[PDB]
Ligand binder design. Structure first.
Ligand SMILES: [Ca+2]
Ligand SMILES: [Ca+2]
Ligand SMILES: [Ca+2]
Ligand SMILES: [Ca+2]
Ligand SMILES: [Ca+2]
Ligand SMILES: [Ca+2]
Ligand SMILES: [Ca+2]
Ligand SMILES: [Ca+2]
Ligand SMILES: [Ca+2]
Ligand SMILES: [Ca+2]
Ligand SMILES: [Ca+2]
Ligand SMILES: [Ca+2]
Lengths: 245, 245, 245, 245, 245, 245
C-alpha cells in the first residue's frame, strides 16, 4: 500500500526523517537505512516541482512512504503534490479551524472535500481512505486554537513544531523551556482526546519511550542535513586526531 | 587559492571524501564538516554537466577544493571539466604511459600540453601551475606499468583503487589480501621515488597514521553515500531499541 | 500570427487538446498531428517554469498556438506566463466578476488593464489585441454568476469544465446528467448573448456537430495522456490476441 | 524481480515498446497500458543522464522492466546505465565479436566480466544472473559476423534492426525486401542455434504469430512517438470530418 | 561579508544591474565586469527555484552581492530566497504599510520579525544585521503611502520603478514626464527624511551625478538583456556597414 | 528554410556569433540583434543535451539558423545533434581526411553517408541537401592535410581556428603573427580551389572587407560572452567616471 494510515491502523510504531537535500539518491539512502516514511520538505527547500515528483517516485521505488511538507500556498501546492503521489501532506503554521477545513477541502474528493478531478469513484474513495492530512502546530495561535483545529473531520494528524513555537513565544530555540514543553504536551492531550494522531519530534532517543508510553506511534527523528553534518564533522575530527597519533 | 598543489607545498596533510550524491547542498555539508577537498565523482554517477558545474561553484562558494573524477572519455570530459573550474582531475583505470601523456596534453596549456584555448599567457601559466593531474591506479596493468606512468612529466599524483584492483586480480573485494596491499605498497614506493604525490584511501583511521609516517599527505576518507547509509542505519536501529526500552 | 483571436475572427473552427505530459516532443507530436492549438496544463501538472517556457517555444517552432492553463495563483503566474509568450491563458475555477476583472488587470496593458511593464506602445497594443483571456467555468458558483462574469470587458472566452462542475453539484463524474448538461447549455447561451466565445469539451465526435450548429468554433478534444493510454492499451491487447491466433 | 531474464525462463511471451519521449509520465503511461518492458532510447534521443535515471525509477515504481538502448560510447554509458538500475542494455550497431566481448566485460562482474566496483559478492552474482546483455544487429557486417557474435558467452539476446540494415544494404526503408527479410531470418536461425534469445520488431500484428511459432518470446511493438502521432493524427482527422457532418 | 548594508555604511557608492537571463555564466560575466551587486530578477523571469539557488552560489563564488527581486507571493518566496543566501530582497508593487510590516515579519528573525527557524542566536542576529529589506515603489498608491511605508522599522531601502509608475499614472513609458519625475523626487525626499536608503535607476550616466549630489549611494544601471541587445545590434550593424566599405 | 546552404547559394553574406552562454534567452537576444546564424558551442561549454535541444528550438522560433559545434566524440554527438534539428555542425580539431570522411558518413543519409535511420526518402534527401558539414582547421596537422581534407565529397565548409592554431605552432595567442595568417590564407586558397566555402573569424571589422573581396561570404564575429564582458566592463567604467564628475 505504502499507506501511513494503514501502518498506524495495525498498532505499529513508525519512524521518519525530514529530507532537506532534494536528491533521489538521498531518498534511496534513507529508505535503505530502514525508515518507514520520509518527509520531503518543500517549505524552506529550493526544490523544483519536477524534482519533487522525482523524489516521490524514488520513494515509491524504494518502498518508503513519501510525505510532503508543502509551502503556505496550499491552493497551488496541494493539488500538484497529491497528483504526484504524495501519501500525506504536512501544512506549516496552521493557526485556525478555517485553514484546516480548507486543507481538507483541497485534499479530499467528494463527499469529504472538493479535490479537483483533473473505476473513477473507487479510485477517489481509495485516495480519501489512505491520504494523511497533517497540520504543523508551531505558533501560539495554533496551540490556542488546538481544540477547534483537532475536531475538524478529515484532519488526521498533528505534528509538533517546537522550534518555531519557541520563537512564537519570544524565546527562540529555548525548546527545553517548560513553556514550550507544556504547550506541546497540551497539543498532544487535546489531539488525542479527539481521536487523532500525534507526531513527535523527539530531541533524544529517550524521548521516544516517553511518548510511546502515552500511545504515540509516529516519530520524526530529525532531518538528513543536520544528521549528516554532525556525523561527518565528528567522524572527520576523530580521523584527524587518530592520524596524528 | 583553493589549490591542492599549494596546500601540499606547505607540508600540510589534506583530507577529502568522494561525493556521489550530486547535490550542491551535499557539497556545502561536506565543506561545513571540515574537509579540505571533495572528489566530485562523475564516473559511475548519473550527473548532468550543468549539475557538475553547479557543484564546482558550490565548492568554490563554500571554500572547499573541487577535484573531479572524470569518465573514460577524456577527449570530451577534460576540457569541459577544467573550464568549469575543477582544481584537479582524477582519470579512472590508468593503464599505461601513453594514456598519462595524453591526459597531460589535454590538461595543460603550452608549453606543458595542448589544452584547448576556447593577460592571457599569465592566466594559462597560473592554470598549469595549480591544476592537479591525478591518475587512478586500479588494475594489474597499471601497477605493472607504474614506473613508466610515474615518470611522465605533468602527472602530479596517483590514487590507489584497491577495490577495482582486487577484481583485476581475480579476488574482488579481498582488499585486505596481501596481494592487494603489496601492490598498493609498491605503487606508493615507485610514485614516491619519482617525486610524485600518493593519495591513500585508508580503510580505517589507524591506516592514516601508518601512511602519514611514510610521508603521505593526501587522504580520501570514503564516500558520502556510504558513510551516510552506515550512520543513518546504525542511528535508527539504536533509536528503535531505545524507544522500546 | 499564431493568434487564436485572429483564427476565430475569420469564421474558422479550431481544434485543441490538453497537454499534461510536459515534454517538448509531445508539443511537436501534437502539432504534427494537425491541432490548431494546444492547452499546456500547469494546474495539476508537475511542471517547472523553465520547462513551460520550453514548451511554448516548441509550440512556436512547430506552428501550433500555445494556450496555458495556469494555477490559482494568478498574481504570480499570469505575468510570467505572458512574458514567456503564451498566446492565451485559461484560469481555473472562476467563480465571480471580481476575479475576472483581476485577471483582465493582470493580462492587459494600459488602457485595458495594468499588466506589468518589465515601438513600446505599439507592442503593448498588439499584445492586448491578440491575447486570449479565458475563464474556466467549473463550479456551481461560476454558473450562477455567469451573467456578471460574461459581461466583463476583456474576458474573451469561457471553457466548460463538466468534470469539476459535476463534483460541485455533488454528482462527481455524472457529466451526462441533465443537471450538468443544462448548466453547460446555460453557460453557453449567456456567454453567447454577451458576444463572447464558448469553448466546448465534446465527449464524442458527434457532439462537435451539435455545438458547431449553434455557432461554437472552439473545441478541446480531450487530453494527450488519456488518449495515449486508451490507444496504447487497446492496441497492445489486440496485438496480444492476434499473436496467440 | 523486474527481470526480463526471469520472465523468459518461464516460457512467457513478453511485449515492449521503444520510449523516445523522455518523460516519466510516458514511462508510467506505457506501464499502465500493459507492456512488460520498455526500451528507453538514448542513442538518438536528447536525454540527460539524470533524466534517464528518473525514467528508470519511474519504470521501477510502475512495475515495468526498464531496458536501455545506449549510445556507441559503451566505455562511458554502460557503467552509468547499470548503476542507475537498467535491467538490460541494448548496444547499437554491433558489428563484430570483439565489440560483444567488450560489452560483456563492461556489463558483468567477475568472473563473467570486469564491471567496475564503484553481502557484496552475492549482490554482484545477482546482478550478473539477471542483467540482459542485448546486441542490435542492423548492418551487413553484423549479419555476416553473426555466428561469431552469437557464440560469445554473456551475450543474452539479439534484436533485429531492419531499418538501418536496409540502409546498410543500399536500400533504405525497403524493409519488406527479400534481402532484408532473409538476412533477419538468418540472424534468428544462427542466434537460436547458439541457444540465445531473439527479439523481433514485427511490422504488423500477424508477424507476432509467425515469429512466436518458431519460438520467439520477445517482441518490441514500435515506438511511443510513432504510435502517438499516427493515432492523434487519425483521430483528429476523423473528428474534423464528423463535426462537419 | 558580501553585505550591501556593510558597503553603504562606509560611504561607498555601489552599482548594480538587473539580471533577467537566468544563467550562472551571466552572473559571472556581470561580476567580472565590475558590478558591486546583481539583482537577480524572479518576478517576470521564467526561473526555477533550483536555478535561482545556483545563481546565488555563482554570485558568492564570483564575489558579487546577490540581491533578489521576488514575486508577489512573499509568503512562499521570502523564506526560500533567504535560505538560499540572498543578501537582500526586493518586493514588487509595494502599496501600503501593512505589506511592508509583513515583509519585515517574514525577513527578520526574532525580535525584529518572525522568520521561520527551519551558535544559533548569533547566526540569527548576523542575518538580521546584514539582510537588506527593499521595497519597489512603482504605483500611485505606493507614492501616496510613502510616509507610512518609509517609517516601518526594518525597511532598509526603497527603489524607484518609473516604468510601472508611469503606467499607474495612465501615461505608460512617459517616464520623462514631470508627473513621474516629481513623484520619484518626492519618494526620495520622504525616504531620506526617515533615514532610509534610496536606490536610483538612472536613465543616463549624467543622472548618477545628479542623484549622488543629494546623497544617493545605490544605483541600478539597467538590465543585462536590454544592454546586450542594444550593444549586439549596434555592433553588428556597424560591422555590416564596414564590411561593405 | 533556415538553411545556411540556401543563403550562401544566393550570393548573400551571412553573419554569425558563437553562443557560449547556454540560455534560450541569449539565443533570442542574438536573433533580435540581427545575426543570420548562431553557433551554439558544446565543445568547451557545460551544456546538457536537453538544454542544447531547447536552444535549437529557441533559434527556430526566433528565425535564426542554429549551427552546432560538437565535441570530439562525433560517434555520439552527431546523430543526437542532427535529430535535434541543427542545420549545420562544426567538428573541432579536424586533422585528416579519414576524420572528414567519417563525419560525412555520420551526417548524411544514403547515398551520401550512413546517418542512422532512427515520404521517408524525400525527407532524407531534403536533410542531405540542406545540412552544412563544417570542419574546424585549428592545428598544424589540419593545415598540412588541407588539400586531402578539402576534396572530401560532403564537406561543405572550413572554419579558421587561429587561436588554437597559434598554440599548435608553439606561439599561443600570437594570432597576428605572419605564421598564423599565412597558414590561414593557405587554408582559404586550397578550400576555395576545391569549390568549398570558407568561414572567417575576423579580428576587426576591417578584416570583413578584406575577406569579402576574395569571395568569402560567411563570418563569425566573436562570441557572446566575450562581447558582453567587454561592453559591460567598458560601460560601467564610463558610468562610474561620469557619476563622480
Ligand atoms: Ca498515507
Ligand atoms: Ca517550521
Ligand atoms: Ca589544485
Ligand atoms: Ca574504480
Ligand atoms: Ca491568441
Ligand atoms: Ca478542473
Ligand atoms: Ca533483466
Ligand atoms: Ca538503429
Ligand atoms: Ca546585504
Ligand atoms: Ca515593475
Ligand atoms: Ca544549413
Ligand atoms: Ca578551438
Amino acid at each position: 500500500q505504502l499507506s501511513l494510515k494503514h501502518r498506524l491502523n495495525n498498532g505499529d510504531s513508525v519512524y521518519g526523517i525530514f529530507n532537506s537535500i532534494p536528491d533521489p539518491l538521498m531518498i534511496e539512502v534513507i529508505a535503505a537505512s530502514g525508515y518507514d516514511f520520509v518527509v520531503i520538505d518543500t517549505e524552506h527547500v529550493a526544490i523544483n516541482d519536477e524534482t519533487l515528483a522525482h523524489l516521490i517516485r524514488a520513494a515509491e521505488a524504494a518502498h518508503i512512504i513519501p510525505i510532503v511538507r508543502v509551502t503556505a500556498v496550499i491552493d497551488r501546492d496541494i493539488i500538484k503534490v497529491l497528483d504526484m503521489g504524495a501519501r500525506g501532506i504536512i501544512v506549516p503554521h496552521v493557526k485556525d479551524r478555517e485553514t484546516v477545513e480548507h486543507i481538507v477541502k483541497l485534499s479530499r474528493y467528494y463527499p469529504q472535500g472538493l479535490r479537483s478531478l483533473n473505476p473513477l469513484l473507487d479510485a477517489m474513495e481509495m485516495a480519501n481512505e489512505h491520504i494523511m492530512v497533517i497540520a504543523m502546530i508551531e505558533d501560539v495561535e495554533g496551540v490556542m486554537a488546538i481544540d477547534d483545529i483537532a475536531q475538524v473531520e478529515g484532519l488526521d494528524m498533528i505534528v509538533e513544531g517546537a522550534a518555531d513555537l519557541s520563537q512564537s513565544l519570544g524565546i527562540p530555540w529555548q525548546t527545553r523551556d517548560d513553556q514550550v514543553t507544556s504547550h506541546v504536551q497540551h497539543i498532544f492531550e487535546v489531539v488525542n482526546a479527539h481521536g487523532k494522531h500525534f507526531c513527535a519530534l523527539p530531541r533524544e532517543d529517550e524521548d521516544i519511550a516517553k511518548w510511546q508510553a502515552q500511545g504515540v506511534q509516529t516519530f520524526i527523528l530529525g532531518d538528513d542535513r543536520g544528521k549528516i553534518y554532525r556525523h561527518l564533522s565528528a567522524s572527520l575530527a576523530t580521523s584527524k586526531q587518530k592520524g596524528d597519533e
